[PDB]
Design a binder for these strands. Structure first.
Ligand SMILES: [Zn+2]
Ligand SMILES: [Zn+2]
Length: 161
RNA sequence: UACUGCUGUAGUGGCUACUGAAUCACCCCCGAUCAAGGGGGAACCCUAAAUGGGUUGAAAGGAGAAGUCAUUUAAUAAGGC
């Protein structure tokens, strides 16, 4: 037998925040706990809210790669590519893309993205029924608005075309 | 993708202008303050006594200029290049 963890395979276009949240919820860890295990401290707790004041470094991502067992390049593929500007707030979601695959796309957080290219829908910045801003992607235990308990996949037919 | 209203000077701040008091070193009065001192008293000592004269709290100085660090505050940003 060899040391192991509840590994999670990353999605396509998922966020670093959402992937780390899924990794934590499948390992019953905590942001401080994940950081301490990785060896980088509370920096992880920062990444879950997209505060990349000092962009996630190559070392700070290799240390994560050692723990979550995902290749460092595959890790960088959930951060915005070098030079692309993202908004850490508000957290934005497309209902149809969540119904297709239950994840949060880092591409939704780009400053330049307002339309889902494969759904032709104006992506959502707040819950379309109760105007409740979405939580951090790592905090999505499941696909529902916290205040109104409306499933994320449902919101697809409330969001405008 | 930004976010707003539910807000009365209402609370709390800042700035300017005119104003209230002290404007002193023992006390009081008149005066200047980019200049200015003048006068009038008290107490004590000396002095028998003479505004006779004296005393009526002490210290220290290397400045200018330019950067930098630190702390705090505030605005902005979601990295910055
Ligand atoms: Zn979509
Ligand atoms: Zn809601």
């Amino acid at each position: 037998v060899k040391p192991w963890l509840f590994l999670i395979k990353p999605y396509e276009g998922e966020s670093l925040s959402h992937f780390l949240g899924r990794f934590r919820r499948a390992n019953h860890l905590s942001a401080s706990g994940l950081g301490t295990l990785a060896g980088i401290g509370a920096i992880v707790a920062r990444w879950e809210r997209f505060h990349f004041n000092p962009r996630p470094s190559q070392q700070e991502l290799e240390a994560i790669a050692s723990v979550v067992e995902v290749d460092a390049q595959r890790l960088a593929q959930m951060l915005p590519p070098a030079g692309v500007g993202m908004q850490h707030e508000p957290i934005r979601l497309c209902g149809a893309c969540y119904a297709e695959s239950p994840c949060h796309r880092i591409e939704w957080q780009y400053k330049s993205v307002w339309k889902c290219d494969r759904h032709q829908l104006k992506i959502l910045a707040k819950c379309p029924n109760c105007q409740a801003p979405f939580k951090m992607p790592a905090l999505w235990e499941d696909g529902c608005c916290h205040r109104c308990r409306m499933p994320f996949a449902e919101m697809a037919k409330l969001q405008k075309v």
